[PDB]
Design a protein around this ligand. Structure first.
Ligand SMILES: *[C@H](CC(=O)O)C[C@@H](O)/C=C/C(C)=C\[C@H](C)C/C=C/C(C)=C/[C@@H](C)C(=O)[C@@H](C)[C@H](O)[C@@H](C)C/C(C)=C/C(=O)O
Ligand SMILES: Nc1nc2c(ncn2[C@@H]2O[C@H](COP(=O)(O)OP(=O)(O)NP(=O)(O)O)[C@@H](O)[C@H]2O)c(=O)[nH]1
Ligand SMILES: [Cl-]
Ligand SMILES: [Cl-]
Ligand SMILES: [Cl-]
Ligand SMILES: [Cl-]
Ligand SMILES: [Mg+2]
Lengths: 1016, 131, 196
């Protein structure tokens, strides 16, 4: 293409062609934009492209061309600056400074080319980071001098200083060594008095854009400057009065005052206290007179979203909440400051009515901070009684749907079951509940009165709406635990009586669904009440059972969830015989279980059975418990027994899709009950166990047969997915039981051998796509719980899953994601609980183990990566614990340097930043092994180095070589100093990590200072 | 004395024969894989003036059309190897993304029941489009 | 008629997946790293007429960054993306924000925490506060489940058009007019476990 001409550096640069490529990129579209983009990227990445920058800057008629020229220079300056000969450095600095001066002096350019100028200023700042103050000591005095000369130049200087303060104080942590950052912080600190003088002068003398630029720079300084600059000058007065009045400066001044409300400031000093009160007082008076009174409808203002109102309101909220959180104590004692305190809070009340979730969270965080303080601090709550009373209203009327309420309104005005969970309101609900709980404790009478009377207006119909009955109901449920049992008694009674009244009066299925969701939520939130009112509890449950036959699927699902919620708390009352009842309610429930659950979806049936298991485990007498368990299991066990008889006689019957569903639901029912009963489930497990393992084998044969007959595509078919579900649920059941078992001798004597026999060879001898990841998961739990008791079984597990699973996952990082994850979990527990199993591996298999570990920590998957690093660490500890024996000596000779170099590789490649902490920990461990002479053999083979030589000397030599070849742009000195520091710091993780971070900075550039590694 | 008081979907002319939630896929031939095209309500729309019946499907929230084509009599609903709750069929003239393009579609439902109800209703609409 | 939107954030946070979801409806499971920038027009129909975003989906991997902040010139709005399963991605949000606002000084910006579908969330909701002092809108999203997937564009359109009550509306639906099928039949539909 014509456009590709700029890529030939053997020919002189056609600036007109560059400008065309650039225009085509930014202003073009389609294929031409795409071609032009590639060309510009190739151009920009040419390691000589920077030599063209002056030419472009001088001759280009295109601002974007010149921007791109400045990016090319920025890259040179931040990575290879110290490579250049000194006259190129001076030359680059001169034409950058000169371009800035020149663009500022031409007003039309200043007005219209802001992007370019800002980019120039950043480019200058990158030069300062390299050169200042050591090779540019007059930069600041001269900048100050230049400022007075022109208003455009002065404005721009403020931008330069803002960017410099940012680069040095706010963004230096990740981008500079500790030593260099300190250097630059000290340098800026030493010159600040003169910068401040210029700043204050500009602010005092009052052009609006110059003032705004100066205030934006001040905002940055407030992050770090000494407090005397803020409190001992007249700057607070200016900020809180003059700069609040004009809307041009008001936005940034408010942000400055928010930062000021955070300065480090003495706690005993009465004058500073007076000044902190005064700036707030001024600020609030300016808002009231220039912006809006305390009575103004901010909800409405925000919704209108005129001009910059939303951001202003956001900023006011941040200012008020920040200031009051630190300083409201200053305003609480003096009666003359009371009006200010209460007005500031009244603004917050108004801000809290705004419909904007993220803003609500900001204000709510502040309310929590306040109400928590009022709960504990003597003599405070009365000050805020009216603020609190208003807050009670705001929270109650803006309560968000809790996770339990499964009905929602659709766009068609129908109350439907939710499609998905409102995952993003979980936390908001919790925060709202927390505040409302405090508010209720602060005045329980006020809260009752607000709620009961809001309810009154729902019955009578005056405020009736779904929105209003909902938030009220959620609010009411949310304060459970805040009242005395006795007041709670009367309160709940009142609320429930009224919600019942409400239901009767509300014709239609959408109304009934809303009101039923609300009643179910409230009753489920008050178990203390339920435990005290048996007739009521029982009638509630019978009613939940009625809802299990509802055609409205939202109500039905909620009934199930509410049933288990109530049972989790009230289970004792279902297990005993209540006065004046003929049997424990659990007996009544079990008996009618087929009727009750007839219309439920299977997973709802399983939840039901799980609830019953919770009750049954309350019975501690073993004979009675087991009988309850076998009663509960009657229907699944009868279905099971006929399935087993049929299946054994003819394996074709297992073929049927309907039978496969039936079997899966049987096992799932067992899982559900086992989950709630844990160790108490054993007798039921015993009833099915041997036949269940026979079923696993039968199903396994069917799956293999189908894959042989239809191909791998078989694994996608509904038939085969149905058969694997059986296998997975069987593994889940066994896993669930073993994870909770208390009799481990029975696990080992009775459960394990048949389990291993049934699952391992089957897993091993299946094609990869037919292998179930859940086998590995099951085996992890087995090793976790009883691995120490079954050393030979652990050997068998490794033999069966290790090599074949590794070969599935060692081609790339993406295939078989579940296997990958379960595989490293299993290796982790084996390494932790039955290390002997690895000691028994043949040498080739052990190498693959080491390979597997190193492969793990090259993953970007966190699941895997984290386990890989932990295994490596645990492995080193395991080797170490063996002491001076041949296996350990051989492990070091073979593997110490593989681990060191592999760990360095992931530390330094920039694609494994999430693992830094654990990587650093592993490296420190490995280095400390040599430092402390815990390696008993030479790591070096003999004649590689003199006979008496130490591993410490050899380790340094090995590392210096490794690093010299991996990072050839580093000097020898840099490498030596880095290694000296790292080895010295190998007992102090915090410092050790700083040194690693410093190295990661230096490898990104040329000519880093080796003395940086002496930082302390 | 009277006081003066203070001061298009294109589905307007159609009858909704049938509505069901669905996920729609299209088969990318070059890479042999299905790609999701949308999730939402799949509607059978019978035009009051022509008695002709179309499939119209819009994505949740954005309400963008992901299917708009006549339920052709020549079309046939086929099972997919992986599913007991989907149909695959070839469509020669879909106008969801502008100009009429041919596609192989797959449409999946919440249950086998819904898939079966869909097919029944799909063949009913084919007969209507015959008359 | 038309607005330049730049999309920035760490590699693997789901920028391209999110954009594709909006463009074609699809969910791309593979991670193919963006090289510099991919530009895509994206139109929404609203009660105030059509709005077109020209979406500059930029590269998050440093090695593939291309023109970097050169991409942001004349951006009229932005999305900053992170991944709630990866803490380093939230940690770097201030870095993306800094580079962006240095070029685009007064534009509406949405911060999106993607992948909220993943059970094991690492960036706690409570932790997410960077947007507050920077005046960014924030949303939990998932390109995979479509959780809040429309909100970032609906918010930006309201800001750009200057209309708080702007809504997405149904686009008009015009009257509509070989071993290729067997392959389609015998290629399994993805995610057969899903609700739909
Ligand atoms: C709509 C009903 C309608 O008629 O329109 C939906 C509604 O049925 C949903 C109801 C739900 C989920 C639960 C109710 C609250 C269960 C009913 C329990 C009930 C009537 C218990 C009786 C035995 C009872 O205890 C009555 C006599 C009491 O008055 C209580 C309502 C209050 C109490 C416990 C007073 C006390 O203990 O002193
Ligand atoms: N679970 C889940 N995965 C997602 C989601 N969004 C994207 N992904 C996955 O995340 C990976 C990376 O997505 P991609 O869009 O390529 O990321 P990107 O931010 O564009 N990366 P780059 O900046 O390098 O171009 C893909 O494997 C994709 O399927 C989500 O919401 N949930
Ligand atoms: Cl420019
Ligand atoms: Cl109890
Ligand atoms: Cl040297
Ligand atoms: Cl960055
Ligand atoms: Mg991408």
């Amino acid at each position: 293409g014509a456009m590709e001409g700029i890529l030939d550096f053997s020919n002189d640069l056609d600036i007109a062609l560059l400008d065309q490529v650039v225009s085509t990129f930014y202003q073009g579209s389609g294929v031409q934009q795409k071609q032009a983009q590639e060309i510009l990227t190739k151009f920009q990445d040419n390691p000589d492209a920077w030599q063209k920058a002056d030419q472009i800057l001088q001759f280009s008629t295109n601002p974007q061309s010149k921007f791109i020229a400045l990016s090319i220079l920025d890259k040179l300056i931040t990575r290879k600056w110290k490579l250049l000969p000194n006259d190129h450095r001076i030359g680059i600095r001169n034409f950058v400074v000169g371009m800035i001066i020149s663009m500022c002096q031409d007003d039309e350019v200043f007005k219209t080319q802001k992007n370019l100028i800002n980019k120039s200023d950043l480019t200058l700042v990158q030069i300062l980071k390299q050169e200042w103050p050591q090779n540019w000591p007059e930069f600041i005095p001269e900048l100050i001098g230049s400022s007075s000369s022109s208003v455009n130049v002065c404005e721009n200087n403020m931008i330069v200083l803002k960017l410099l303060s940012e680069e040095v104080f706010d963004f230096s942590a990740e981008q500079m060594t500790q030593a260099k950052a300190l250097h630059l912080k000290n340098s800026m600190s030493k010159e600040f008095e003169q910068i401040f003088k210029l700043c204050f002068q500009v602010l005092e003398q009052g052009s609006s854009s110059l003032i705004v630029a100066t205030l934006e720079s001040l905002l940055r300084y407030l992050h770090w400057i000494p407090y005397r600059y803020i409190y001992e000058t007249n700057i607070l007065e200016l900020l809180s009065t003059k700069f609040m009045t004009s809307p041009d400066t008001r936005a940034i001044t408010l942000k400055c005052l928010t930062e000021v409300s955070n300065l480090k400031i003495p706690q005993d000093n009465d004058l500073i206290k007076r000044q902190t009160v005064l700036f707030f007082q001024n600020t609030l008076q300016q808002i009231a007179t220039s912006v809006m009174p305390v009575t103004a409808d901010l909800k409405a203002t925000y919704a209108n979203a005129n001009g910059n109102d939303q951001s202003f309101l956001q900023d006011l909220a941040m200012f008020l909440t920040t200031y009051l959180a630190r300083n409201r104590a200053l305003l609480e004692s003096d009666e003359s400051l009371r009006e200010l305190l209460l007005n500031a809070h009244q603004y917050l009340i108004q801000l809290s009515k705004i419909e904007e979730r993220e803003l609500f969270k900001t204000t709510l965080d502040y309310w929590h901070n306040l109400v928590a303080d009022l709960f504990y601090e003597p003599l405070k709550k009365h000050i805020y009684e009216e603020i609190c009373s208003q807050l009670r209203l705001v929270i109650i009327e803006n309560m968000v749907r809790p996770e339990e309420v499964l009905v929602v309104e659709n766009d068609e005005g129908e109350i439907v079951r939710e499609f998905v969970k409102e995952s993003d309101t979980i936390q908001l609900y919790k925060s709202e509940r927390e505040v409302l709980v405090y508010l209720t404790h602060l005045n329980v009478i006020d809260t009752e009165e607000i709620m009961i009377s809001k309810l009154a207006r729902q019955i009578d119909g005056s405020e009736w709406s779904w929105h209003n009955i909902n938030t009220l109901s959620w609010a009411i449920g949310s304060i459970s635990g805040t009242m005395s049992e006795d007041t709670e008694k009367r309160f709940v009674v009142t609320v429930i009586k009224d919600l019942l009244d409400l239901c009767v009066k509300k014709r239609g299925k959408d109304n009934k669904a809303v009101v039923a969701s609300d009643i179910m939520y409230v009753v489920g939130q008050y178990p203390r009440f339920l435990k005290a009112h048996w007739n009521f509890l029982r009638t509630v449950i019978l009613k939940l059972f009625e809802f299990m036959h509802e055609t409205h699927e939202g109500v039905q699902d909620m009934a199930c969830d509410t049933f288990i919620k109530i049972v989790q708390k009230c289970k004792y009352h279902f297990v005993i015989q209540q006065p004046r009842e003929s049997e424990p309610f659990i007996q009544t429930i079990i008996r009618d279980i087929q009727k009750t659950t007839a219309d439920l979806q299977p997973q709802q049936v399983h939840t039901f059975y799980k609830a019953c298991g919770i009750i049954i485990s309350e019975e501690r007498s073993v004979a009675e418990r087991n009988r309850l368990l076998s009663d509960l299991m009657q229907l699944p066990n009868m279905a099971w027994d006929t399935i087993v008889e049929q299946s054994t006689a003819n394996p074709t019957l297992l073929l049927d899709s309907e039978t496969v569903k039936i079997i899966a639901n049987i096992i799932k029912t067992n899982v559900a009950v086992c989950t709630s009963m844990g160790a108490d489930f054993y007798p039921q497990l015993g009833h099915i166990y041997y036949n269940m393992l026979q079923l696993y084998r039968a199903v396994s044969s069917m799956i293999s047969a189908q894959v042989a007959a239809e191909g791998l595509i078989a694994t996608k078919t509904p038939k085969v997915r149905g058969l694997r579900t059986i296998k997975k649920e069987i593994l889940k059941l066994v896993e669930t039981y073993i994870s909770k078992a208390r009799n481990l001798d029975d696990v080992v004597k009775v459960l394990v051998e048949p389990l291993l026999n049934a699952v391992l060879e089957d897993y091993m001898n299946n094609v990869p796509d037919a292998r179930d990841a859940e086998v590995l998961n099951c085996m992890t739990t087995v090793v976790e719980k009883v691995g120490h008791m079954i050393p030979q079984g652990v050997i068998l597990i490794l033999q069966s899953v290790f090599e074949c699973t590794l070969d599935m996952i060692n081609k790339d990082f993406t295939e078989y994601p579940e296997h990958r994850v379960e595989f490293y979990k299993l290796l982790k527990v084996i390494n932790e609980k039955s290390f002997a199993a690895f000691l028994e591996l043949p040498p080739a298999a052990f190498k693959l183990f080491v390979d597997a570990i190193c492969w793990a920590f090259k993953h970007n998957n966190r699941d895997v990566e984290v386990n890989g690093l932990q295994i490596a660490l645990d492995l080193v500890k395991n080797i170490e614990r063996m002491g001076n024996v041949p296996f350990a000596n051989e492990f070091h000779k073979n593997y110490f340097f593989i681990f060191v170099s592999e760990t360095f590789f992931v530390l330094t490649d920039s694609d494994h930043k999430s693992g830094f902490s654990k990587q650093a920990l592993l490296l420190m461990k490995l280095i400390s092994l040599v430092y402390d002479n815990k390696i008993s053999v030479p790591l070096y083979q003999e004649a590689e180095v003199p006979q008496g030589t130490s591993n410490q000397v050899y380790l340094s030599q090995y590392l210096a070589n490794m690093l010299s070849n991996a990072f050839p742009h580093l000097t020898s000195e840099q490498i030596a100093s880095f290694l000296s520091a790292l080895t010295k710091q190998c007992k102090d993780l915090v410092v050790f990590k700083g040194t690693l971070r410093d190295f990661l900075v230096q490898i990104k550039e040329v000519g880093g200072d080796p003395t940086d590694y002496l930082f302390a | 004395i009277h006081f003066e008081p203070v001061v298009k979907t294109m589905e307007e002319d159609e009858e909704v024969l049938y509505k069901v939630r669905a996920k729609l896929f299209r088969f990318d031939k070059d890479a042999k894989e299905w790609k999701e095209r949308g999730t939402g309500d799949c509607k059978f729309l019978k035009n009051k003036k022509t008695n002709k019946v179309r499939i119209l499907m819009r994505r949740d929230k954005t309400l963008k059309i992901c299917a708009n084509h006549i339920i052709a009599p020549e079309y046939t609903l086929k099972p997919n190897v992986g599913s007991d709750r989907s149909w695959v069929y070839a469509c020669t003239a879909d106008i969801a993304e502008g100009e009429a393009e041919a596609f192989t579609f797959a449409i999946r439902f919440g249950s086998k029941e819904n898939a079966d109800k869909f097919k029944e209703e799909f063949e009913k609409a084919q007969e209507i489009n015959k008359k | 008629v038309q607005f330049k939107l730049v999309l920035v954030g760490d590699g693997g946070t789901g920028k391209t997946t999110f954009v594709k979801r909006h463009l074609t409806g699809e969910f791309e499971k593979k991670y193919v790293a963006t090289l510099g920038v991919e530009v895509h027009p994206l139109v929404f129909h609203t009660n105030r007429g059509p709005i077109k975003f020209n979406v500059w989906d930029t590269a998050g991997q440093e090695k593939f960054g291309g023109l970097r902040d050169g991409y942001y010139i004349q951006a009229q709005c932005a999305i900053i993306m992170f991944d709630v399963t990866s803490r380093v991605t939230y940690k770097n949000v201030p870095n993306w924000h800094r580079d962006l606002v240095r070029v685009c000084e007064n534009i509406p910006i949405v911060l999106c925490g993607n992948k909220v579908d993943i059970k094991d969330r690492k960036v706690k909701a409570k932790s997410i506060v960077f947007h507050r002092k920077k005046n960014l809108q924030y949303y939990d999203i998932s390109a995979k489940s479509n959780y809040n997937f429309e909100k970032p564009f609906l918010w930006l359109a309201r800001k750009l058009i200057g209309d708080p009550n702007l809504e997405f509306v149904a686009m008009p639906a015009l009257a509509p007019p070989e071993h290729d099928l067997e392959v389609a039949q015998t290629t399994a539909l993805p995610d057969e476990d899903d609700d739909l």
